[PDB]
């Protein structure tokens, strides 16, 4: 069913061809997720910039890339959110809310369970979550398929703590 | 066009928004820089700035980014200036 | 039973015009002189005037000056008592950890009360409940230590990587950490609640050498090229020297001790007794003890200037008072909201920190 998900996804972003190559930009995006020195490994990673320039480009070329394969061998699904689509005042469970995303929802309950070995995670924006979140009241959930709005929910992936062992962008 | 570069915890996101690039030639300027790379980071720390050069150009000028507070700016710029200066003789 | 009232101690001009804007937009849709303070210039200077003086100084007599007055200028908050802070003029960075996570803040910004720290670095979540109350800072800035009570270890991190992690552990199990040192060869020790002062290898990791004194006698410690001072309730000096390993020098106080110093430049040492009784002793000649000034609160901090002409004093007594150097003489007083327990000056002599019960107020000093 991946393959048939990567098909999907090629589908979804055929924009720009010069954007898609195999640049030396890429051979360092890659050792990224690499330990720089051998005592230190990290795993969130941070591209920040000025808005105009084609970020958001960028990382639908890495989303667009996996589906051609070999861009993270480490690395098995991406998970794609765009903040400025999908308003956060409602809230849904995340297995729920990763099920809008995605074709299938049967396996991906089960994809979960493969997540921690090898895992994905994209997003985009989260300028104007910051300001419309109070952040004077916060809580955490540990376990996933809950029934939670979506930025505690959010809150919770970056704290590695619903997602241990995992990877960042 | 894109370009990537890191970035150390330790520098402020504000200090990053004024570039100081300086042109010089090009033989003149990548041959002070050196291949080392352990080399630059330990330069990259004593003088706190950020320091990367790229010449892409088929052309005989380079360009060189430093990134700092303006005191630390004036550092970086004396030093390449005085290996470039002794790269003649 | 006086009590301070705080106020909005910056009330910056730029600040003034964005607060106006603001109340303007709520008004329109109803229907339906002044003293400012100069900003922290990229956190490093303040570039203001010196202060007049009614002679002139000698041509050997140039670098050696005193402080007149304190000012303020920004508030940090923190949610628990902070017990330690560090400047780092080097990078900017201003360090107070308390309760579960550690909180570094950068001076780069320009805002009245800042609450988002750079970091927020928890040690609650290594185990279930560990304490700390200390934090050490290297010389060079490329290394940051901070000891607890339940701690396997003291911590060790890193500042000239790319990304701020941990190296070290240097493990202390049943022990509590209370006090922490460092020297030049590239090797610390601490001292803990018993009198355990060990040192341990920076770069490899192990245990060199064990000292063992009575219980509570470490509480304070200072290092110098080869002497070790110790200090605790036992109301006693004791002097080790690294190269035989044993005490050297025995001296009796009439109370507790509570605070100790050193001179960069000169041979003298400072100490703080629980009754408020400052003394004076010099290192090399060892001859006595000498007492300048007596306070009625206890003494808590104590710290010289860059230079070593002049210290100032903090503790429960609603004030923080600065000496001379010479006599001891009080120079000027600055009240509090609280009883102050730790304080931090720069390297070049430009900035200082208070911290009363949660939030750390930053002065500037003028010259």
């Known amino acids: 069913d991946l393959q048939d998900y990567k098909a999907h996804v090629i589908a979804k972003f055929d924009t720009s061809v010069?954007?898609?190559?195999?640049?030396?930009?890429?051979?360092?995006?890659?050792?990224?997720?690499?330990?720089?020195?051998?005592?230190?490994?990290?795993?969130?990673?941070?591209?920040?910039?000025?808005?105009?320039?084609?970020?958001?480009?960028?990382?639908?070329?890495?989303?667009?890339?996996?589906?051609?394969?070999?861009?993270?061998?480490?690395?098995?699904?991406?998970?794609?959110?765009?903040?400025?689509?999908?308003?956060?005042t409602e809230?849904?469970?995340?297995?729920?809310?990763?099920?809008?995303?995605?074709?299938?929802?049967?396996?991906?309950?089960?994809?979960?369970?493969?997540?921690?070995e090898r895992l994905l995670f994209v997003i985009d924006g989260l300028d104007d979550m910051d300001s419309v979140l109070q952040h004077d009241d916060?809580?955490?959930?540990?376990?996933?398929?809950?029934?939670?709005?979506?930025?505690?929910?959010?809150?919770?992936?970056?704290?590695?703590?619903?997602?241990?062992?995992?990877?960042?962008? | 066009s894109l370009r990537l570069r890191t970035r150390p915890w330790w520098f402020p996101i504000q200090e990053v928004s004024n570039p100081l690039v300086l042109y010089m030639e090009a033989w003149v300027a990548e041959r002070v820089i050196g291949t080392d790379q352990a080399e630059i980071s330990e330069i990259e720390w004593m003088c706190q700035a950020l320091l990367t050069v790229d010449s892409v150009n088929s052309g005989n000028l380079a360009e060189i980014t430093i990134f700092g507070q303006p005191s630390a700016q004036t550092r970086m710029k004396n030093i390449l200036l005085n290996m470039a200066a002794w790269h003649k003789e | 039973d006086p009590q301070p009232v705080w106020d909005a101690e910056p009330q910056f001009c730029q600040g003034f015009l964005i607060q106006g804007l603001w109340e303007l937009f709520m008004d329109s849709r109803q229907k339906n002189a002044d003293k400012?303070?100069?900003?922290?210039?990229?956190?490093?200077?303040?570039?203001?005037?010196?202060?007049?003086?009614?002679?002139?100084?000698?041509?050997?007599?140039?670098?050696?000056?005193?402080?007149?007055?304190?000012q303020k200028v920004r508030v940090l908050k923190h949610q628990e008592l902070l017990l330690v802070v560090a400047v780092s003029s080097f990078t900017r960075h201003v360090f107070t950890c308390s309760q579960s996570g550690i909180k570094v803040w950068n001076l780069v910004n320009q805002v009245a009360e800042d609450r988002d720290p750079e970091s927020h670095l928890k040690c609650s979540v290594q185990d279930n409940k560990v304490y700390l109350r200390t934090c050490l800072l290297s010389s060079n800035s490329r290394t940051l230590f901070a000891g607890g009570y339940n701690l396997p270890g003291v911590i060790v991190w890193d500042l000239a990587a790319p990304s701020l992690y941990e190296k070290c552990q240097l493990p202390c199990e049943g022990l509590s950490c209370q006090a922490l040192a460092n020297t030049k060869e590239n090797m610390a020790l601490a001292g803990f609640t018993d009198g355990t002062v060990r040192i341990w290898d920076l770069r490899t990791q192990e245990i060199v050498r064990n000292l063992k004194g009575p219980t509570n006698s470490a509480r304070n410690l200072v290092v110098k090229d080869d002497n070790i001072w110790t200090g605790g309730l036992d109301a006693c000096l004791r002097c080790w020297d690294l190269r035989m390993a044993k005490v050297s020098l025995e001296h009796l106080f009439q109370s507790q001790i509570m605070s100790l110093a050193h001179s960069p430049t000169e041979d003298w040492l400072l100490l703080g007794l629980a009754n408020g009784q400052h003394c004076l002793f010099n290192s090399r000649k060892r001859d006595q003890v000498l007492t300048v000034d007596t306070k009625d609160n206890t003494i808590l901090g104590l710290k010289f200037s860059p230079n070593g002409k002049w210290w100032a004093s903090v503790g429960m007594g609603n004030f923080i008072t600065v000496h001379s150097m010479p006599t001891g003489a009080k120079l000027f007083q600055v009240p509090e909201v609280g009883p102050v327990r730790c304080f931090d000056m720069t390297e070049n002599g430009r900035l200082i920190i208070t911290g009363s019960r949660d939030c750390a107020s930053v002065y500037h000093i003028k010259y």
């Open chain 3, 36 to 70: 400012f303070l100069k900003p922290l210039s990229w956190g490093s200077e303040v570039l203001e005037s010196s202060c007049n003086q009614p002679s002139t100084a000698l041509w050997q007599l140039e670098r050696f000056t005193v402080p007149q007055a304190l």
């Open chain 1, 91 to 116: 809230k849904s469970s995340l297995a729920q809310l990763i099920a809008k995303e995605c074709p299938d929802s049967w396996d991906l309950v089960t994809k979960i369970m493969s997540q921690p």
């Open chain 1, 138 to 169: 916060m809580t955490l959930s540990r376990d996933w398929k809950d029934e939670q709005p979506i930025y505690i929910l959010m809150y919770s992936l970056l704290r590695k703590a619903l997602l241990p062992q995992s990877f960042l962008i």
């Open chain 1, 18 to 88: 010069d954007l898609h190559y195999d640049s030396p930009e890429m051979k360092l995006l890659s050792d990224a997720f690499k330990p720089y020195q051998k005592t230190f490994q990290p795993h969130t990673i941070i591209l920040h910039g000025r808005p105009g320039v084609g970020k958001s480009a960028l990382a639908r070329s890495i989303v667009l890339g996996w589906a051609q394969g070999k861009l993270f061998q480490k690395m098995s699904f991406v998970i794609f959110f765009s903040v400025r689509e999908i308003k956060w």
